C-alpha cells in the first residue's frame, strides 16, 4: 500500500506533498552551502581553500536553491496541490506523467551531489561558462554530471509545464472562462509557458557544451571557429525567463494571501494583474543580453537591451500598486502569512529597483560581476521568492495537513528571518558600489566590515531555518485539528475541508451561464 | 465519478522512467570518463521497457477500457502540440548556433564560410533526394489519414506503409551520406553544426518512424475507428514537424551554408 | 487478420481489482519484475560507481 | 582603491566615471523615493480600522500607475543613453596597449613602436612591503601617460577573465579569440587598482590590475627601460 | 487509503518523539551533506 | 478526400522521388579526395573519443577522412 | 605614426577583424611586392597597424601557420 | 603574356565581373604604388588582363568617371 | 472571443504602436545632407517627367533631393 501510494502515485495532492518534502530537504542543502560561503567571507583570509572549493560551494548553492528548492516548492508543490482544487478539477490532465516529473528530481539531485564528490567539483558558477567549464580547465566528470543534472531537471519541468498548461486550459468547469480563474492559476499557466519555451534552449546549449567536452565539437572553442559568447546567449535566452519562472508563482501566492488577510473577496484590478503577468512573461524573452553588457556587444544593441529591460517596471508596478490597493480598506488580519506577504511587497520592490539600476548598460559596466548584482538578486530571491514560499506555506499548511501552526512561533520565525536576510544583503550594495567582485574566496582588507556584518546576518537566517523545522515539528506533535476557515466563498481550495479527501471533485462543481 | 476525465491506476512506469534517466546519464558519464558502457546499456534497456509498458497501458486504457472521452482526447491534443513546440525550441538553439558561426566566420576558419578546407556536400544530390523523400512521406501520410477517416482499412495500411518506407529510405540515405562525408564532427564548427543538427534530426526521424510503425501494427489489430485515432493524429503531427525541421536544415545548412 | 478488440475489451474490463499494468496476466508481472529489478539493481550499481569515482 | 567602510563608488579618475557618479546620484534618488513611497503606503493601508471591502473600480487609477512609471523610466533612460553613446564616441587615441588574461595573471603588450611585453602578478601577502595592500599590489604595474586618450585592447589566452578598474569606470571581458576595445583617460597621476571580474578558476581572487599614471616623459623612459 | 489529518503523508506522526527523530535525520542529513562534501574535497 | 491524396502520392510525390533518385544515381561515384593539409581548425582533438583507439570519428571512412596526421 | 587610427570599417568594441584584416593586407602586399621584386616599404602602413592592434601570440601563431602551409586566410 | 588566362573566380559565360575586378585591381594597385611613390610595373598583370577583356567604351567611361569624381567603385 | 482580441488590441498591439511612436519621435531630427556627387546611376533622366518642368520627381524635397545639376 505504501509503495503504491508514494512511489506509484497518480494523485495531485500526494505528488504536491512529495514536491514540498523534496524542496524542504533541498532548502537545508542550499542553506548549508550559503553558510559555507559566508563562513569563508566572514573574516579576511582563506578558511576552506582556494577559489575552486569555494566556487564549487557557490555553484552548488545556486543550483540547489533554484532547481531543487524554489521550482519544486512553487510549481511542483503549491502548483500540484492548489491548481486542480482552484478549478474544481479531479486531478491533473496527465496524472501518471506528473509522477515522473517528481521522480526525475531525486536523480537530478544525485547527479549534482556526484559532480561535487568526483575530481575537484564543478567550480564554474551556475552559468557554467566555457572555456572554464570546458574539458581543459575542468577536465573530468564534474561538469558532465552537472550538465546531466540540468538535463533531468529540464525534462521534469518541460513535462510539468505541458501538464499544467493542458490542465488549466482543458479541465476548468465548462462555464468558467480563463478570466474566471484565480490569479495563482494564471501565474502557474504563464510560468509553464516560460518553462516550455526557455528550457529547450538551455538543453540545446548545455548539450553543445557536452559535445565540446566529449565529442570534439567546437561550438564554443575559437580554435574550431566557435565562440564562448554563443554559449552565453543560449544560457541567458533561458536564464532571464528562468528568473520570471522563479517569481511568477510567488506573485500568484502573494495576490491570494493579500486578498485573504485583507478580508477581501477579490484582488484589486484582476484583469490588470493578468495583463501584468502576461506582459512580464513576454518582455522576459527579449532582454537576456542585460547579462552580457561587458562582453563587447555593439552600442545600439546595448541601447536596445537597456530600454527593453526597463519596460518590465511598468507591468511590475501595476502589480505592486494593485497589492497596495487590495490592502486599502481591508479588515487586516496580522497573520504570519500576511507578514511574509507585506515583507515581500517592500523587499521585492527594493530588489526590482536595484535591477532597474543594473538595466543601465553604462552603469552596469561598473556594477557587473560585483556584489551589487548579488544584492539585487538576493532581495528578489531570498526576500521575494522565499517570502512568497514562507507566506504560502504558513497560509496553506492547515489545508495540506489538517493541523494548525503556532501563530506566535510563526511570527517569531518571520521576525528573525526578516532581520537576518536584511543584515546579510543590505551591506552587499556597499561592497558592490565600492568594487568587490563576485565569486571571490577573499577580498582586499577595505571590504572587511561589510563582509563581517553580512556573514553575521547569514547566521541569524540559519537560526530562523532551524526554528522553522521546530515549528513544523510542534504542529504535527500537538495535532490541533482545523475547524472553520473564513472566506471559502472566494477560496475554493478550502471548501473540501482540511485535509481534503484523496479524491475531490469526483462530482464536478455546478456553474451555470 | 460524474466528470469525463481519466483517474489513472497507480503506475510504476514514472519511477522506472526516472531511474532509466539516471542510468542513461550516469551511463554516458561512465562511457565518456571511465571507459565502460555497462550502466548506459542498462539505462537504454530500462528506458525501452518503460516506454513499451507505459504506452501499452495507454492503449489498454483507451482502445480496451474506454477512458478516452472527448475531454481526455482534447487534453492529449494539447499535450502533443505543447510537446512539439518544446521540440521546435530545442532545434531553434542548434539553428542559432549555426547562424552565429556562419554569419561571422572567425579568423581560425579563414574568415569565410564554408571554412577553408571544408568541401560541402552538393545540395542537389542526396540532400535534394532526402527532401523529395520527406515531402513525399508528408503526402502519403495525408492519404493514410483520409483513408482512415473514410473507413478504408486497405488504403490506410498501404499509405502508412509507403510513409514508413520513405522514413526508412531517408534514414538509410542519411547513414550513407554520413559515411561518405569528407568532413567529420571534429572538423570545427562546420562539422559540429552539421552533425549535431542533422544528427538530432535523424534521431527524430527514427522516433517518428517508430511511432508510425506502432500506428501500423495498431491499425492491423483494428484499434483505430474512423473517428477515434489520436495516436495516428499525434504520429502524423510529429511526422510533419520532422519534415518541416528538415526543410529548415536543407535551406540553412545544406544550401545557404554551402 | 480479424478484429479481436471485443475480446481484449472483455479481458481489460474484467472486475478483478488488477491495475492496468498487470491486467494482461502473468506475462505483465514477469516484464514488471524484469524492469524494476534492472532499474533498482542498476541504481545500486550507479551508487557503487559514484563511490569508486569519488576517490583517486 | 576602496577604503574601509566605503558606501558608494570609488572617486572618479576619468570624466566618464564622473558622469556615471552624477547619473547614479539621479537614479538612486528615484530608487530611494519609490522604495520610501511603497513603505509609507503599506504603513498607511495598515493603520486604520476604517474599512471598504466592496468591489473597487480599477481603470482611472491604472492610468496613473502606468503613465507616472513610464515618465520616470524615460527620465532614467535619457541620461543613461547619453552616457552610453558618449563612451562609444570616436576619440583618437595617442597609444594602444593590449592586456591578455591568463590563469592567474595579466600580461601587457605595448607594440605601437617596440616589442614591449611583460607579466603582472599579485604580490604574495608574505612578500608585501610595509604599507602595501593585501591582494592588490602587482610586481609590474601598467605604467601609462596621464591626461592622454589610451586604447586598451583585452583578450585571453585561456579561460574568460575580465579587466576592471572601477575608478576609471572600466570593465572589459577578456575572451579567447576576441579583441575587445575600451578607452582609458586619467585626469590625474597616481595608482588605480582593479581585480579580475570573470570567474577563471583557483586564483580568480588573486590576479589584480595596477595602473601607474605618470607624465608622458616618464612613461617614454619607463617604456625604453622595459625592452 | 487512509484519509484525514496525519494519514495523507508518507511519514508517521503517531508518536511525536519518533517523529522528532525522523525529522532530525531528514533535515539534519540535508544540512550536514555539504559540510561532509567539503571535508571529502579537503581530504583528497 | 483519400482519392485526391492518393492521386498526389502516386502522380506527383513518388514520381519526384523517382526523378531525384535518378539525378543522385547519375552523380554518384567517388570524386578525387583533396590534398591533406593539417589545418588546426579541423581534425579537432581536445579529448580522445570514447571508442576505438580514441583518434577515429564514429563513422570514419578511410577513403575521405584523414586523421590529424593525414590519410591512413 | 603614434597608433592605429579609428577605422570606420571597425567601429565597435570587437576589434578582432581589424587586427586580422591588417595582418592579411600586410602579407598580401608583401607577397605582391616580393613577387614583381618591387619594394615591401609600400606595405609599411599595414605592418604598423597590425603590430599595434594584434596580440603577439596571434601574430606568432599566424606566422607559424604561414610557414607550415596551414594558414587558412588567402594571401 | 598572350591573353588573359582562365580564372576560376569567373568560370561562366558572363565575364562582366572579370573585366570589372581586374580594372579595380589595376587602379587600386596603381594608387598604392603612386601613394608611397613605389613602382606601377608591379600592377602590370592587372593592366594586361583588363585591357584584354574590357570593352574600350567601358574602360573609357570608367576613366572619365574617375577624373570626374563619379566612379562608383572604391579605389 | 472578442474579449481576448480586445485584450490583445489594448494590452499589446496599441502599447507597441505607442512605444514605436516614442522611438520614432526621438530620432525625428533632420540629418546632415551629404555632399552632392553627380553619379551617372542616380538622378536618371531618359524622358522628362509629365509634370512641372520635367526635371523634378513627384515628391521632390528641395532640402534632400538634388537635381542632376545639384541641390537647388
Ligand atoms: C534590520 C536590518 C539590520 C541591519 C542592516 C545593515 C546595516 C548597515 C549600516 C549602514 C550605515 C553606514 C554608515 O557607516 O553610516 C555612516 C554614514 C556617514 O555618512 P557619509 O560618510 O557622509 O556618507 C554619505 C555618502 O557620501 C552618500 O553618497 P555615497 O555615494 O557615498 O552613497 C551611496 C550609498 C548611500 O546610501 C545610504 O546611505 C543608504 C541608507 C539606507 C537607508 C535605510 O549607497 C547606496 O546606494 C545604497 C543602495 C541601496 C539600495 C536601495 C535601498 C532602498 C531604501 C529603502 C527605503 C526605506 C527608508 C525609510 O552615514 C550615513 O549616510 C548613514 C548610512
Ligand atoms: C540526493 C538525493 C535526493 C534526496 C531528496 C530527499 C527528498 C525525497 C522526498 C520524498 C520523501 C520520501 C517518501 C517516499 C519514499 C520514502 C520511503 C520510506 O522508507 O519512507 C519512510 C519515511 C517515513 O517513515 P515512517 O514514519 O516509518 O513510515 C510511515 C509509513 O506510513 C509506514 O510505511 P510502511 O510501514 O509500509 O513502510 C515504511 C518503511 C518502508 O517503506 C517501504 O516499504 C519503502 C521501500 C522503498 C522506499 C524507496 C524510497 C526512497 C526515498 C527516495 C529519495 C532518495 O519506511 C521506513 O520506516 C524505513 C525506510 C528507510 C529509508 C529512508 C528514505 C527517506 C528519504 C531520504 C532522505 C535523504 C537521504 C540522502 C542522504 C544524504 C547523505 C549525504 O518516509 C520519509 O522519509 C518521509 C520523510 C521523513 C519525514 C520528514 C517530515 C518532514 C515534514 C516537513 C513538512 C513539509 C510538508 C508539508 C505538507 C504536509 C501535509 C501534506
Ligand atoms: C526572482 C529573481 C529575479 C527577478 C524577478 C529579477 C528582476 C529584474 N532584474 Fe534581475 N537578476 C537575478 C534575479 C532576478 N531579477 C539574478 C539571479 C541575477 C544574476 C544572474 C547571474 O549572473 O548569476 C540577476 C541579474 C540582473 C541583471 C544583470 C546584472 C549584471 O550581471 O551585471 C540585470 C540587468 O538589467 C537585472 C535586472 C532586473 C530587472 C530590471 C528586473 C525587473 O523584473 C524588476 C522590476 C520591478 C520593479 C522595478 C519594482 C516594482 C515596480 C514599481 C514599484 C513601479 C515603479 C518603478 C519604477 C518607475 C522604476 N537583474
Ligand atoms: C533562490 C535562490 C537563492 C536563495 C534563496 C539564496 C540564499 C542565500 N544566498 Fe545565494 N545565490 C544564489 C541564489 C540564492 N541564494 C545564486 C543564483 C547565486 C549566484 C551563484 C553564482 O555566482 O554562480 C548566489 C550567490 C550567493 C553569494 C555570492 C557568492 C560569490 O559571489 O562568491 C552569497 C554571498 O553571501 C550568497 C549567500 C546566500 C545566503 C546567505 C542566503 C540565505 O538567505 C539563505 C537562507 C535560507 C533560506 C532562505 C531558507 C531556504 C529554505 C526554504 C525556503 C525551505 C522551506 C521549507 C518549507 C517551505 C517546508 N549566495
Ligand atoms: C502614400 C502611400 C503610397 C501612395 C501611392 C502612390 C501615390 C501617387 C500614385 C499612385 C499610383 C501608384 C502605383 C505605383 C506606380 C508607380 C509610382 C508610385 C510610387 C510613388 O509615389 O513614388 C513617387 C514617384 O511617383 C511618380 O513618379 C509618379 C506617380 C504617378 C504616376 C503613375 C503612373 C503609372 C501607373 C501604372 C499603372 C499600371 C497598373 C497595373 C495594372 C495591372 C493589371 C494587369 C516617389 O516620389 P519621388 O519624389 O521619386 O521620391 C521621393 C523623394 N522625396
Ligand atoms: C542517421 C542519423 C541518426 C543518428 C544516430 C547516430 C549516433 C547515435 C546517437 C544519436 C543522437 C543525436 C545527436 C547526438 C550528438 C552527436 C551525434 C551527431 C550525429 C552523428 O552520428 O554524427 C557522427 C559522429 O557521431 C558521434 O560522434 C557519435 C556519438 C555517439 C554518442 C552520442 C552522445 C549523446 C549525447 C547526449 C544527448 C543529450 C540529449 C538531451 C535531451 C534534452 C533534455 C532536456 C558523424 O560521424 P563522423 O565520423 O564524425 O563524420 C562522418 C565522416 N565520414
Ligand atoms: C533509437 C531511438 C531511441 C530513443 C527513444 C524514443 C524511441 C521511440 C519512441 C517512439 C514513440 C512511440 C509512441 C507510441 C504511443 C502509443 C500509444 C498511443 O498512441 O496512445 C493513444 C493516445 O495517444 C497518446 O497517448 C500520445 C502519446 C505520444 C507520445 C509520442 C512522443 C514522441 C516521443 C519522443 C521521446 C524522446 C524524444 C526526445 C529526443 C531528444 C491512444 O489513443 P488512440 O490512438 O485514440 O486509441 C484509442 C482508440 O482505439 C479508441 O477507439
Ligand atoms: C542484466 C544485467 C547482467 C549483466 C550485467 C552487464 C555486464 C556487462 C559487463 C561488461 O563490461 C564491458 O566490458 C567491455 C570490455 O571489457 C567494455 O568495452 C570497452 O573496452 C573495449 C575493448 O576492450 C573497447 O573497444 C570499448 O571502446 C570499451 O568501452 C564495455 O564498455 C563494458 O560495458
Ligand atoms: C540488475 C543488476 C544491474 C547489473 C549491475 C552489473 C554490475 C557488474 C558489471 C561488471 O563490472 C565491470 O567491471 C569491469 C572490470 O572487469 C569493467 O570493465 C571495463 O573497465 C576495465 C577495468 O580495467 C577496463 O579493462 C575496460 O575499460 C573495461 O573492460 C566494467 O567497467 C564494469 O562494467
Ligand atoms: C497606491 C495604493 C492606494 C490605493 C488606492 C485605491 C483606490 C480605490 C478606489 C476605488 O474604490 C471606490 O471607492 C468609492 C467610495 O469611496 C466607491 O464609490 C467606488 O465605487 C469605488 O470604486
Ligand atoms: C492481406 C492483408 C490484409 C490486412 C487485413 O485486412 O487484415 C494486407 C492489407 C494491406 C497489406 C499491406 C499493404 O498492402 C502494404 C505492403 C505491401 C507489400 O507488397 C507487402 C507488405 C504490406 C505491408 C502489406 C501486408 C499485408 O498484405 C496487408 C496488411
Ligand atoms: C489568453 C490571452 C490573453 C491576451 C492578453 C494580451 C495582453 C498581454 C500582452 C503581452 C503579451 C502577451 C502575449 C500573448
Ligand atoms: Cu582571471 Cu578571474
Ligand atoms: O535575470 O534578471
Ligand atoms: Cu535577466
Ligand atoms: Mg561577467
Ligand atoms: Na575568505
Three-class secondary structure assignment of chain F: CHHHHHHHHHHHHHHHHHHHHHHHHHCCCCCCCCCCCCCCCCCCCCCCCCCCCCCCCCCCCCCCCCECCECC
The alpha carbon of A23 is separated from its chain's Cα centroid by a whole number of angstroms, namely 11
CATH topology of domain C1-56: Cytochrome C Oxidase; Chain J (4.10.91)
- Point out the ligand nearest to the CA of residue A243: 3
Maximum distance among all alpha carbons in chain C? Answer: 63
Measured distance CA(A251)–CA(A337) in Å, rounded: 14
What residues of chain C lie within 8 A of the CB of A141, using their CB?
53
Residue A446 Cα to ligand 1 midpoint, Å, equals 17
How far, in Å, are A252, A488, B5, E8 from residue A506 at the CA level?
26, 19, 10, 18
Q: Which domain holds residue E44?
A: 1-44
In this complex, how many residue pairs, one in chain A and one in chain I, have their CB atoms less than 8 Å apart? 11
In sequence order, the β-bridge partners of residue D99 are: D108, D154
Q: Which three cell numbers stand for residue E31?
A: 544540512
Please report the sign of the dihedral spanned by the C-alpha atoms of residue A150, residue A155, residue A159, residue A161. Answer: positive
Maximum distance among all alpha carbons in chain F? Answer: 60
Please report the sign of the dihedral spanned by the C-alpha atoms of residue B145, residue B149, residue B150, residue B154. Answer: positive
User: Do residues A233 and A207 touch, judged by C-beta distance below 8 A?
Assistant: no
Maximum distance among all alpha carbons in chain B? Answer: 70
Supply the CATH classification number for the domain D92-227. 2.60.40.420
Q: Is A429 annotated as a binding residue?
A: no
Measured CB to CB, residues of chain G less than 8 Å from chain D are 1-6, 11-16, 18-19, 48, 51-57
Residue A468: in which H helix or E strand, if any? Answer: helix A448-478
- Residue boundaries of the structural domains of chain D: 2-91, 92-227
* Atom in ligand 5 nearest the alpha carbon of residue I61: 53
- Residue boundaries of the structural domains of chain B: 1-67, 68-258
Q: Whose C-alpha lies nearest to ligand 2, atom 84?
A: E23
In sequence order, the β-bridge partners of residue D118 are: D108
D196 — alpha (psi -120 to 50), left (phi > 0) or beta?
Answer: beta
Measured distance CA(B102)–CA(G34) in Å, rounded: 34
Residues 6+ apart with CB under 8 A from A466: none
Contact C56 E40 (CB under 8 A): no
Phi first, then psi, for residue D200 (nearest 5°) are -140, 15
What residues of chain B lie within 8 A of the CB of G20, using their CB?
107, 111
**Vertex A172 angle, CA A238 and A388, to 5°:** 50
Q: Which residue has the cell 474484467?
A: C14
Correct CATH for F1-72 of 4.10.95.10, 1.10.150.20, 2.70.98.10, 1.10.3720.10: 4.10.95.10
The CB density around residue B35, as the number of other CB atoms within 10 Å, is 10
Residues whose beta carbon lies within 6 Å of some atom of ligand 5: I 57-61, 65
- CA of D110 to nearest chain A CA: how many angstroms apart? 21
Measured distance CA(D140)–CA(D211) in Å, rounded: 10
The SS3 call for residue D210 is strand
* Atom in ligand 4 nearest the alpha carbon of residue A246: 1
Q: Which three cell numbers stand for residue G56?
A: 603577439
Measured distance CA(H46)–CA(H22) in Å, rounded: 5
**Vertex F45 angle, CA F39 and F50, to 5°:** 150
Torsion of CA A350, A355, A360, A361, to 10 degrees: 150
Phi first, then psi, for residue G25 (nearest 5°) are -60, -40
User: Do residues A469 and A24 touch, judged by C-beta distance below 8 A?
Assistant: no
Measured distance CA(B176)–CA(F28) in Å, rounded: 12
Residues 6+ apart with CB under 8 A from D170: A365, D152, D163, D164, D182, D184, D194
In sequence order, the β-bridge partners of residue D122 are: D138
Q: Is B223 in the pocket of ligand 7 (CB under 6 A)?
A: yes
Measured distance CA(A303)–CA(B253) in Å, rounded: 32
Residue ranges of alpha helices (H) inside A284-426 are 299-311, 313-327, 336-359, 361-367, 371-380, 386-401, 407-425
The SS3 call for residue D108 is strand
Contact A479 E6 (CB under 8 A): yes
Q: What is the DSSP string of A147-162?
A: HHHHHHHHHHHHHHHH
Contact A165 B82 (CB under 8 A): yes
- Residue boundaries of the structural domains of chain F: 1-72
CA nearest to G62 within chain F: F40
Q: Which domain holds residue A190?
A: 2-513
CATH topology of domain B68-258: 1.20.120
The alpha carbon of A61 is separated from its chain's Cα centroid by a whole number of angstroms, namely 13
Residue B42 Cα to ligand 8 midpoint, Å, equals 12
* Atom in ligand 5 nearest the alpha carbon of residue I49: 27
In sequence order, the β-bridge partners of residue D191 are: D212
Peptide bond into A68 cis (omega under 30): no
**Chains with at least 3 CB pairs less than 8 angstroms from chain G:** A, B, D, F, H
Phi first, then psi, for residue D89 (nearest 5°) are -55, 150
Q: Give how many domains chain A has, as a whole number.
A: 1
Method used to obtain the model: X-ray
* Atom in ligand 2 nearest the alpha carbon of residue A113: 1
Measured distance CA(C34)–CA(B147) in Å, rounded: 40
User: What are the strands, taking DSSP E only, across H1-75?
Assistant: none
User: Do residues A435 and A443 touch, judged by C-beta distance below 8 A?
Assistant: no
How far, in Å, are B87, G35, H26, H34, H59 from residue H47 at the CA level?
57, 16, 6, 15, 11
How far, in Å, are A126, A129, A130, A184, F41 from residue A135 at the CA level?
17, 12, 9, 43, 17
Q: Which three cell numbers stand for residue B188?
A: 570545427
CATH of the domain at A112: 1.20.210.10
Measured distance CA(I10)–CA(I5) in Å, rounded: 9
Residue C51: in which H helix or E strand, if any? Answer: helix C26-53
**Which of these, A250, A392, A411, lies nearest to A334 by C-alpha position?**
A411
Tell me if the domain spanning G1-75 has CATH number 1.10.10.140: yes
What residues of chain A lie within 8 A of the CB of I12, using their CB?
279, 282
Measured distance CA(D207)–CA(D174) in Å, rounded: 13
> Quick one: resolution in A?
1.8
Please report the sign of the dihedral spanned by the C-alpha atoms of residue C32, residue C38, residue C44, residue C47. Answer: negative
How far, in Å, are A120, A374, D109 from residue A377 at the CA level?
28, 5, 38
User: Do residues B4 and B70 touch, judged by C-beta distance below 8 A?
Assistant: yes
Amino acid at each position: 500500500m505504501f509503495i503504491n501510494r508514494w512511489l506509484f502515485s497518480t494523485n495531485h495532492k500526494d505528488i504536491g506533498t512529495l514536491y514540498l518534502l523534496f524542496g524542504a530537504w533541498a532548502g537545508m542543502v542550499g542553506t548549508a552551502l550559503s553558510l559555507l560561503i559566508r563562513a569563508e567571507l566572514g573574516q579576511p583570509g582563506t578558511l576552506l581553500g582556494d577559489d575552486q572549493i569555494y566556487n564549487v560551494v557557490v555553484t552548488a548553492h545556486a543550483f540547489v536553491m533554484i532547481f531543487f528548492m524554489v521550482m519544486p516548492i512553487m510549481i511542483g508543490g503549491f502548483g500540484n496541490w492548489l491548481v486542480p482544487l482552484m478549478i474544481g478539477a479531479p486531478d491533473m490532465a496527465f496524472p501518471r506523467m506528473n509522477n515522473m516529473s517528481f521522480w526525475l528530481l531525486p536523480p537530478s539531485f544525485l547527479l549534482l551531489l556526484a559532480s561535487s564528490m568526483v575530481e575537484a567539483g564543478a567550480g564554474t558558477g551556475w552559468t557554467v561558462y566555457p572555456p572554464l567549464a570546458g574539458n581543459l580547465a575542468h577536465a573530468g566528470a564534474s561538469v558532465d554530471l552537472t550538465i546531466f543534472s540540468l538535463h533531468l531537471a529540464g525534462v521534469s519541468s518541460i513535462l510539468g509545464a505541458i501538464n499544467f498548461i493542458t490542465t488549466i486550459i482543458n479541465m476548468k468547469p465548462p462555464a468558467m472562462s480563463q478570466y474566471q480563474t484565480p490569479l495563482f492559476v494564471w501565474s502557474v499557466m504563464i510560468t509553464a509557458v516560460l518553462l516550455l519555451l526557455s528550457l529547450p534552449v538551455l538543453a540545446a546549449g548545455i548539450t553543445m557544451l557536452l559535445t565540446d567536452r566529449n565529442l570534439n565539437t567546437t561550438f564554443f572553442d575559437p580554435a574550431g571557429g566557435g565562440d564562448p559568447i554563443l554559449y552565453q546567449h543560449l544560457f541567458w535566452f533561458f536564464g532571464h525567463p528562468e528568473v520570471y519562472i522563479l517569481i511568477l508563482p510567488g506573485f500568484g501566492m502573494i495576490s491570494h494571501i493579500v486578498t485573504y488577510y485583507s478580508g477581501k473577496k477579490e484582488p484589486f484590478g484582476y484583469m490588470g494583474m493578468v495583463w501584468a503577468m502576461m506582459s512580464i512573461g513576454f518582455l522576459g524573452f527579449i532582454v537576456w543580453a542585460h547579462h552580457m553588457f561587458t562582453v563587447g556587444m555593439d552600442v545600439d544593441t546595448r541601447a536596445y537591451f537597456t530600454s527593453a529591460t526597463m519596460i518590465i517596471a511598468i507591468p511590475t508596478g501595476v502589480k505592486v500598486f494593485s497589492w497596495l490597493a487590495t490592502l486599502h480598506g481591508g479588515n487586516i488580519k496580522w497573520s504570519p502569512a500576511m507578514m511574509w506577504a507585506l515583507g515581500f511587497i517592500f523587499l521585492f520592490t527594493v530588489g526590482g529597483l536595484t535591477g532597474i539600476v543594473l538595466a543601465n548598460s553604462s552603469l552596469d559596466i561598473v556594477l557587473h560581476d560585483t556584489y551589487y548584482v548579488v544584492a539585487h538578486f538576493h532581495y528578489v530571491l531570498s526576500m521575494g521568492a522565499v517570502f512568497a514560499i514562507m507566506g504560502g506555506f504558513v497560509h496553506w499548511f492547515p489545508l495540506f495537513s489538517g493541523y494548525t501552526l503556532n501563530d506566535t512561533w510563526a511570527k517569531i520565525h518571520f521576525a528573525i528571518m526578516f532581520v537576518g536576510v536584511n543584515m546579510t544583503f543590505f551591506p552587499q550594495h556597499f561592497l558592490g558600489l565600492s568594487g568587490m567582485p563576485r565569486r571571490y574566496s577573499d577580498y582586499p582588507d577595505a571590504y572587511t566590515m561589510w563582509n563581517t556584518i553580512s556573514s553575521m546576518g547569514s547566521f541569524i537566517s540559519l537560526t530562523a531555518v532551524m526554528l522553522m523545522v521546530f515549528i513544523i515539528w510542534e504542529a504535527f506533535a500537538s495535532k490541533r485539528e482545523v475547524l472553520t476557515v473564513d472566506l471559502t466563498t472566494t477560496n475554493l481550495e478550502w471548501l473540501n475541508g482540511c485535509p481534503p479527501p484523496y479524491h475531490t471533485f469526483e462530482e464536478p462543481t455546478y456553474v451555470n451561464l | 465519478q460524474t466528470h469525463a476525465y481519466h483517474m489513472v491506476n497507480p503506475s510504476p512506469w514514472p519511477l522506472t522512467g526516472a531511474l532509466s534517466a539516471l542510468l542513461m546519464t550516469s551511463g554516458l558519464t561512465m562511457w565518456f570518463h571511465f571507459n565502460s558502457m555497462t550502466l548506459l546499456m542498462i539505462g537504454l534497456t530500462t528506458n525501452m521497457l518503460t516506454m513499451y509498458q507505459w504506452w501499452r497501458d495507454v492503449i489498454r486504457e483507451s482502445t480496451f477500457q474506454g477512458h478516452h472521452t472527448p475531454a481526455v482526447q482534447k487534453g492529449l491534443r494539447y499535450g502533443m502540440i505543447l510537446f512539439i513546440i518544446s521540440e521546435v525550441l530545442f532545434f531553434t538553439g542548434f539553428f542559432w548556433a549555426f547562424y552565429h558561426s556562419s554569419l561571422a566566420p572567425t579568423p581560425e576558419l579563414g574568415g569565410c564560410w564554408p571554412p577553408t578546407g571544408i568541401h560541402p556536400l552538393n545540395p542537389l544530390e542526396v540532400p535534394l533526394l532526402n527532401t523529395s523523400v520527406l515531402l513525399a512521406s508528408g503526402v502519403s501520410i495525408t492519404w493514410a489519414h483520409h483513408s482512415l477517416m473514410e473507413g478504408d482499412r486497405k488504403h490506410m495500411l498501404q499509405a502508412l506503409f509507403i510513409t514508413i518506407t520513405l522514413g526508412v529510405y531517408f534514414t538509410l540515405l542519411q547513414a550513407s551520406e554520413y559515411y561518405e562525408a569528407p568532413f567529420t564532427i571534429s572538423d570545427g564548427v562546420y562539422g559540429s553544426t552539421f552533425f549535431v543538427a542533422t544528427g538530432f534530426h535523424g534521431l527524430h526521424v527514427i522516433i517518428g518512424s517508430t511511432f508510425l510503425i506502432v500506428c501500423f501494427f495498431r491499425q492491423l489489430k483494428f484499434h483505430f475507428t474512423s473517428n477515434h485515432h489520436f495516436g495516428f493524429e499525434a504520429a502524423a503531427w510529429y511526422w510533419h514537424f520532422v519534415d518541416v525541421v528538415w526543410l529548415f536544415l536543407y535551406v540553412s545548412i545544406y544550401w545557404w551554408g554551402s | 487478420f480479424e478484429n479481436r478488440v471485443a475480446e481484449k475489451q472483455k479481458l481489460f474490463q474484467e472486475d478483478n481489482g488488477l491495475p492496468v499494468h498487470l491486467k494482461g496476466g502473468a506475462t505483465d508481472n514477469i516484464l514488471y519484475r524484469v524492469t524494476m529489478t534492472l532499474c533498482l539493481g542498476g541504481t545500486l550499481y550507479s551508487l557503487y560507481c559514484l563511490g569508486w569515482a569519488s576517490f583517486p | 582603491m576602496a577604503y574601509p567602510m566605503q558606501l558608494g563608488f570609488q572617486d572618479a579618475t576619468s570624466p566618464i566615471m564622473e558622469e556615471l557618479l552624477h547619473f547614479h546620484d539621479h537614479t538612486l534618488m528615484i530608487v530611494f523615493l519609490i522604495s520610501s513611497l511603497v513603505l509609507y503606503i503599506i504603513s498607511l493601508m495598515l493603520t486604520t480600522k476604517l474599512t471598504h471591502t466592496s468591489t473597487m473600480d480599477a481603470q482611472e487609477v491604472e492610468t496613473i500607475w502606468t503613465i507616472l512609471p513610464a515618465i520616470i523610466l524615460i527620465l532614467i533612460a535619457l541620461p543613461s543613453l547619453r552616457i552610453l553613446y558618449m563612451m562609444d564616441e570616436i576619440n583618437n587615441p595617442s597609444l594602444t596597449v593590449k592586456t591578455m588574461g591568463h590563469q592567474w595573471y595579466w600580461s601587457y603588450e605595448y607594440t605601437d613602436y617596440e616589442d614591449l611585453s611583460f607579466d603582472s602578478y599579485m604580490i604574495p601577502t608574505s612578500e608585501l612591503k610595509p604599507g602595501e595592500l593585501r591582494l592588490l599590489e602587482v610586481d609590474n604595474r601598467v605604467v601609462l601617460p596621464m591626461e592622454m586618450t589610451i586604447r586598451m585592447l583585452v583578450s585571453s589566452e585561456d579561460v574568460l577573465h575580465s579587466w576592471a578598474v572601477p575608478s576609471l569606470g572600466l570593465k572589459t571581458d577578456a575572451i579567447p579569440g576576441r579583441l575587445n576595445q575600451t578607452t582609458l583617460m586619467s585626469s590625474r597621476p597616481g595608482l588605480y587598482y582593479g581585480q579580475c571580474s570573470e570567474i577563471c578558476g583557483s586564483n580568480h581572487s588573486f590576479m589584480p590590475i595596477v595602473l601607474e599614471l605618470v607624465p608622458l616623459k616618464y612613461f617614454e623612459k619607463w617604456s625604453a627601460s622595459m625592452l | 487509503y487512509e484519509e484525514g489529518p496525519g494519514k495523507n503523508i508518507p511519514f508517521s506522526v503517531e508518536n511525536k518523539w519518533r517523529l522528532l527523530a525522523m525529522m532530525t535525520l531528514f533535515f539534519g542529513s540535508g544540512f550536514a551533506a555539504p559540510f561532509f562534501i567539503v571535508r571529502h574535497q579537503l581530504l583528497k | 478526400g483519400a482519392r485526391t491524396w492518393r492521386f498526389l502520392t502516386f502522380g506527383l510525390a513518388l514520381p519526384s522521388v523517382a526523378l531525384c533518385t535518378l539525378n543522385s544515381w547519375l552523380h554518384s561515384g567517388h570524386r578525387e579526395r583533396p590534398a591533406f593539409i593539417p589545418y588546426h581548425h579541423l581534425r579537432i582533438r581536445t579529448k580522445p573519443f570514447s571508442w576505438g583507439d580514441g583518434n577515429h570519428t564514429f563513422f570514419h571512412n578511410p577513403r575521405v577522412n584523414p586523421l590529424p596526421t593525414g590519410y591512413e | 605614426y603614434q597608433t592605429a587610427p579609428f577605422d570606420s570599417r571597425f567601429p565597435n568594441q570587437n576589434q578582432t577583424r581589424n587586427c586580422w584584416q591588417n595582418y592579411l593586407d600586410f602579407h598580401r602586399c608583401e607577397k605582391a611586392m616580393t613577387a614583381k621584386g618591387g619594394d615591401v616599404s609600400v606595405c609599411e602602413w599595414y605592418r604598423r597597424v597590425y603590430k599595434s592592434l594584434c596580440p603577439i601570440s596571434w601574430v606568432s601563431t599566424w606566422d607559424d601557420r604561414r610557414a607550415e602551409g596551414t594558414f587558412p586566410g588567402k594571401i
